[PDB]
Design a protein around this nucleic acid. Structure first.
Ligand SMILES: [Mg+2]
Ligand SMILES: [Mg+2]
Ligand SMILES: [Mg+2]
Ligand SMILES: [Mg+2]
Ligand SMILES: [Mg+2]
Ligand SMILES: [Mg+2]
Ligand SMILES: [Mg+2]
Ligand SMILES: [Mg+2]
Ligand SMILES: [Mg+2]
Ligand SMILES: [Mg+2]
Ligand SMILES: [Mg+2]
Ligand SMILES: [Mg+2]
Lengths: 124, 141, 146, 185, 55
RNA sequence: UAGUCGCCGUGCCUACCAUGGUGACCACGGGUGACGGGGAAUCAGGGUUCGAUUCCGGAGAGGGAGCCUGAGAAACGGCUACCACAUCCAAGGAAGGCAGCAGGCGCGCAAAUUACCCACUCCCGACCCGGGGAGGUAGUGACGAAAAAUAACAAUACAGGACUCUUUCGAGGCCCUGUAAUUGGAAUGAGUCCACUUUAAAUCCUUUAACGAGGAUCCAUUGGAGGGCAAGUCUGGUGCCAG
């Protein structure tokens, strides 16, 4: 029982892509998940669902309208080439490393302390 | 005014500047001798140690034995007669215990029977004297 | 008066001629030496000495509260007490009052930390409280048990 | 250095005399009529009125044919006619002095609801509103103080997602239906 | 003298507090009050007696 | 007047002449719990006090002083002294500065977690790749601002009031208002809690299944009750004592 119109749709000549805010109507239910949303936009836009990365939905109070931003890239190669790291890890195909920022800093200074070949021995 | 001249701004202002000082309250605010003499030094509260319990007798028509307590402040060393108010609260105040003291709502003026006592006790040993009087909390022993 | 310090917990108690009294006692959750390894262990003793001194600040504050009276001691004697040099930091600390350093009667080491140790520190005092009948009793009954 | 606003103010002012017997009377009369929660709630209205009268005097005090006075007056007028207090024929800022608080309190939603009759009492109306039972033009309304414009006054009715509306029963009928059904077997 | 501290409060009879029906609250409580002022009573001659006026 | 220095003008500095300049229009000197301003609080109109504080300008990194290096420093997370204070030594020596962030001592009436991240904003660098306790994000936080629950309704009794009626008292009930631990079912979060979304990964919030309220025990407080000042000559104790 979902319906989807587009809003502020635009044709970008410089990445040769289209971008628009997807206005959904979804009465009586939660924020619909992104996996299904991507497959269904894929069939909407006559494109594979691999490339459609959609994010930032927010259901309004009252509960018959979510809003999230979306754009569709011309290739997988171009999207992977020029797309956010956080927006790939949303899905899992990319996975940021889970080394804490302070531990990287402490690494930097610990390496900064010693001169010479012991640099290799610095890493664990 | 009396000199309602168009160019006597200076003469007027000067006169005003001299006469503000004859007002007793302005002088009170701006000379330091009052602020420095006050042990509170422009403060609401002040901590202090109890060193003895004193029964000061009341003034006329009235007739009563007010229960005050001689505190010595830590920061200055000055001595104060902080009065404990209500019924049966003095048995709580043990000697050699820290109490937070406040004013008495008069800005340097004696109040009624208790002659020359501008201060009252709020806490005892991180324990509100109210809570002890009401019976909500207990003294830590 | 008597201040009793320990990594376990404190205790404050007074002493008349014959009678022994207890004034106050408390706890502090000073986290221990193991704390956190590798990263922190090298800088652990420095942070821990700061925290121990903060505990020292709290003990110091209690002694000022009790043994000071308008920057002048009202109780006659004050026996500081602790183990592992707890009392010495309390003695030499700058929070500890100078008019009081004039009248530091004694510092006394104890074990385990507590009331029995409070009693032992009285036994080390013994010679200091010569005027007291409790001390003369301690010495006499010490010979009687001999 | 931080990315914050810090712009806020108090919305109301307390009365200068605390125990006027006539004042206490008046606040109680109006409370009884309109089912309000306390006196602050009124006084914040008194504050909005205070703003209106003070600006209204400013324009009257200016000279006529001041382009500032004309534009500002016509904008104030737009807001008042939109809410639908004064009539569009009636719009002129001298009548603002001959003007009273009750006309603004009339356009609260708890009152407008009791007047409409869809609520039994004014208090019931309040209980319904706060219980999220009703909507306006596809927009769920939790807040009884909502000032209803004339455009959106007519479109009030029950909501579709409601036990009262065409939907599932509430928590208590869930308990009474489940408990009564279990009592049956 | 300092002998009499805390005499009377103590010697009075420490009576236990009796139970009562919980009072109405909030908006409804203020409603009830309004009603007890205006809507219930009718005009009566003379000087009005106070709320807790008992005799 | 003539030079020195200095990037130029000038007691900036040097030398030689002249003897001037300010002052009751408050100079000069002393104080200031004074960094300044943009502003805030208060108000009829006039005014009064405050303004360290997230934007601008100034000055400063223990005290004073001196300098190399550099386009730019009289730099303090660069050096050299003396002074103040502190840390180790095999005795010859070594090294030092949180008015950066956290955190701590001390002073006090008086003030927060050694948390996460460059994903947003911008900045630096030789830069399509690096770094950023600037900044942002969470934790605590009753300095304060906005909205908003802690019951609502019906039927039975009763007391009353517009109606018909009735000499009053009472009677008939279309009308009601209130009340009654008298019944009746209807409605909700707070919370519990599957599932998504949120988002760097989470959390909170919004949406949603399932539990979650009849004394809706899911127990709302602080101050008062002679006057000033809205409101008990109610009951028991004390008797210039206590307050
Ligand atoms: Mg400005
Ligand atoms: Mg500035
Ligand atoms: Mg400036
Ligand atoms: Mg500086
Ligand atoms: Mg320097
Ligand atoms: Mg550092
Ligand atoms: Mg610097
Ligand atoms: Mg410092
Ligand atoms: Mg960034
Ligand atoms: Mg920072
Ligand atoms: Mg009064
Ligand atoms: Mg009265």
């Amino acid at each position: 029982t979902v319906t989807i119109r587009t809003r502020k749709f635009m044709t970008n000549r410089l990445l040769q892509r289209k971008q628009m805010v997807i206005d959904v109507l979804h009465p009586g239910k939660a924020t619909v998940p992104k996996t299904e949303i991507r497959e269904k936009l894929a069939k909407m836009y006559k494109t594979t669902p691999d490339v459609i990365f959609v994010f930032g939905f927010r259901t309004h109070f009252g509960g018959g309208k979510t809003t999230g931003f979306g754009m569709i890239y011309d290739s997988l190669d171009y999207a992977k080439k020029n797309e956010p790291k956080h927006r790939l890890a949303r899905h899992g195909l990319y996975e940021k490393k889970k080394t804490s920022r302070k531990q990287r800093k402490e690494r930097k200074n610990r390496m900064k302390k010693v001169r010479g070949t012991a640099k290799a021995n610095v890493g664990a | 005014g009396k000199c309602r001249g168009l160019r006597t701004a200076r003469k007027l202002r000067s006169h005003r500047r001299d006469q503000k000082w004859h007002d007793k309250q302005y002088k009170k605010a701006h000379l330091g001798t009052a602020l420095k003499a006050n042990p509170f030094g422009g403060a609401s509260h002040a901590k202090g140690i109890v060193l003895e319990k004193v029964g000061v007798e009341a003034k006329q028509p009235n007739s009563a034995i007010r229960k005050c307590v001689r505190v010595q402040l830590i920061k200055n060393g000055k001595k104060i007669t902080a009065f404990v108010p209500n019924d049966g609260c003095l048995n709580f105040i043990e000697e050699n215990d820290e109490v937070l003291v406040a004013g008495f709502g008069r800005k340097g003026h004696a109040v009624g029977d208790i002659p020359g006592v501008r201060f009252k006790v709020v806490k005892v040993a991180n324990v509100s004297l109210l809570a002890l009087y009401k019976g909500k909390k207990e003294r830590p022993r | 008066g008597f201040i009793v310090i320990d990594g376990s917990g404190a205790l404050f108690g007074t002493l008349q001629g014959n009678t022994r009294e207890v004034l106050h006692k408390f706890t502090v959750d000073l986290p221990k030496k193991h704390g956190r390894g590798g990263q922190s262990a090298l800088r652990f003793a420095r942070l821990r000495m700061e925290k121990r001194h903060n505990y020292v600040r709290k003990v110091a504050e209690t002694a000022v509260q009790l043994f000071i009276s308008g920057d002048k001691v009202n109780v006659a004697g004050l026996v500081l007490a602790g183990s592992a040099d707890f009392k010495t930091e309390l003695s030499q600390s700058d929070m500890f009052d100078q008019r009081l350093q004039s009248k530091v009667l004694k510092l006394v080491d104890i074990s385990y930390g507590g009331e029995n140790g409070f009693n032992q520190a009285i036994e080390l005092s013994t010679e200091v409280l010569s005027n007291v009948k409790f001390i003369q009793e301690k010495k006499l009954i010490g010979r009687y048990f001999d | 250095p931080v990315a914050r606003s810090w712009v806020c103010r108090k919305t109301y002012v307390t009365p200068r005399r605390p125990f006027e017997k006539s004042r206490l009377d008046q606040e109680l009369k109006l409370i009884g009529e309109y089912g309000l929660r306390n006196k602050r709630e009124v006084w914040r209205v008194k504050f909005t009125l205070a703003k209106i009268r003070k600006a209204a005097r400013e324009l009257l005090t200016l000279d006529e044919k001041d382009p500032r006075r004309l534009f500002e007056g016509n904008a104030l007028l737009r807001r008042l006619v939109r809410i639908g207090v004064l009539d569009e024929g009636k719009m002129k800022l001298d009548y603002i002095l001959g003007l009273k608080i009750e006309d603004f309190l009339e356009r609260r939603l708890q009152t407008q609801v009791f007047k409409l009759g869809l609520a039994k009492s004014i208090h019931h109306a309040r209980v319904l509103i706060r219980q999220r039972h009703i909507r306006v033009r596809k927009q769920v309304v939790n807040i009884p103080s909502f000032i209803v414009r004339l455009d959106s006054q007519k479109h009030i009715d029950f909501s579709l997602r409601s036990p009262y509306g065409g939907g599932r029963p509430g928590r208590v009928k869930r308990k009474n239906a489940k408990k009564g059904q279990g009592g049956a077997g | 003298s300092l002998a009499r501290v805390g005499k009377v409060r103590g010697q009075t009879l420490k009576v236990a507090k009796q139970e009562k029906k919980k009072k109405r609250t909030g908006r409804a409580k203020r409603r009830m009050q309004y009603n007890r002022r205006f809507v219930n009573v009718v005009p009566t001659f003379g000087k009005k007696k106070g709320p807790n006026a008992n005799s």
